[PDB]
Design a protein around this ligand. Structure first.
Ligand SMILES: Cc1cc2nc3c(=O)[nH]c(=O)nc-3n(C[C@H](O)[C@H](O)[C@H](O)COP(=O)(O)O)c2cc1C
Ligand SMILES: Cc1cc2nc3c(=O)[nH]c(=O)nc-3n(C[C@H](O)[C@H](O)[C@H](O)COP(=O)(O)O)c2cc1C
Lengths: 211, 211
């Protein structure tokens, strides 16, 4: 019962989103190709992602569940249960789709908050003799990212940090397959915006046949 | 005067914060050395950092102005005001000190929100024929970061993304000088903790004599 998690990190504004257009093309084609697959959406601007406070983690990837947990308010226990829920939904899926805009060489803050919620020891990684090892050894992931300028080549490619960070987390979680699909340069060459968008949508449709 | 911004990204009620300990030691010595200098604090867990709404920008770094501003919602007009306040405060300063914990190879989400607030065209960068170029050519920066693991050498150094990102942003804003001051390993060596903290505190008082 292949399950796919469509994770969007985009506010619900008037301005047209290139990343959400490519994402929509990808995910609509994917379901037409794979009608039996379950696709679950997590819209990070609609869902509540808890803030990390002193109380929710006892250390790196260690959800509070000891004597300090029992000393928590029902509010703080509810926060720990929500992080548990976010993480469980993440580990339960076979495939991950991230959709994001490039903001100041990275992604919206709430995608970091989401990563912080699902990075849990015994769930996405474990502590070994040789250090942290990922558990998600049979998953695959895709990032659909829109960028105003060109980041796939030239001096700018070294400044990209959003896809680069997601690549580091997927490595850390031991995800063996991480695809990038980029719609870029439409703010640098607005005369070519519709051609750039159409080309990325076609690429998205192609990837939806093999993902 | 010389104006120093002390920017902290740490949840409150942590009665064992390594980054804030070293931060304390660096800034307390700095004020004693330089009692004439104005030090302004921005605690990102006290102040409100607006959520980006793409509708308040006309392009990367460009806050809506004139008719574009006049057609906004009341909430949107207030956000532009707050972003312009945060950006003005950042530009006003001669020196920047960032204090953060390493969370999942990066920093708390609110520090991304703060960068998104101060990356403004005409203030921290400008466009030219070649695209964006930094405006902050006169200024100096330091990152005080706590890591529960070693990231200054080995294969792990290549997974570190929080200091690496701040380094890209300082470079983008044209800040010619960016130092890191790290407290690392106290989690890999719980008994060495009190020792590692004192070494870093030492190094902090040291740098505060010259910065
Ligand atoms: C807050 C903000 C930050 C941005 N930062 C960048 C940037 O770092 N580099 C760039 O080339 N374009 C930047 N842009 C332009 C966007 O990457 C571009 O508009 C992209 O299409 C955003 O994705 P979306 O269309 O899905 O919203 C920025 C835009 C905004 C609103
Ligand atoms: C949410 C969270 C994420 C963390 N992620 C990492 C990590 O990626 N690598 C690491 O070596 N330690 C990690 N740690 C351990 C912290 O970096 C370590 O506790 C550090 O001292 C935090 O700074 P502070 O002491 O000022 O709170 C993490 C801890 C927390 C609570």
């Amino acid at each position: 019962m292949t399950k796919v998690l469509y994770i969007t990190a985009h506010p619900h504004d008037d301005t047209q989103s290139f990343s959400m257009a490519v994402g929509k093309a990808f995910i609509d084609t994917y379901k037409e190709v794979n009608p039996d697959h379950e696709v679950e959406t997590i819209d990070l601007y609609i869902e509540d992602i808890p803030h990390i406070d002193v109380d929710v983690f006892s250390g790196w990837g260690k959800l509070r569940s000891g004597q300090g947990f029992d000393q928590l308010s029902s509010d703080e226990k509810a926060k720990v249960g929500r992080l548990s829920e976010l993480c469980e939904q993440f580990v339960s899926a076979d495939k991950y789709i991230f959709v994001s805009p490039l903001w100041n060489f990275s992604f919206p803050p709430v995608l970091k908050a989401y990563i912080d919620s699902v990075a849990v020891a015994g769930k996405t990684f474990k502590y070994t003799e040789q250090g942290p090892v990922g558990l998600l050894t049979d998953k695959k992931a895709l990032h659909i990212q829109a960028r105003g300028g060109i980041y796939s080549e030239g001096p700018a490619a070294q400044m990209e940090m959003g896809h680069r960070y997601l690549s580091i987390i997927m490595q850390f979680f031991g995800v063996p397959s991480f695809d990038g699909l980029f719609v870029e340069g439409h703010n640098a060459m607005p005369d070519k915006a519709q051609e750039i968008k159409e080309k990325a949508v076609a690429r998205a449709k192609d990837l939806a046949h093999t993902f």
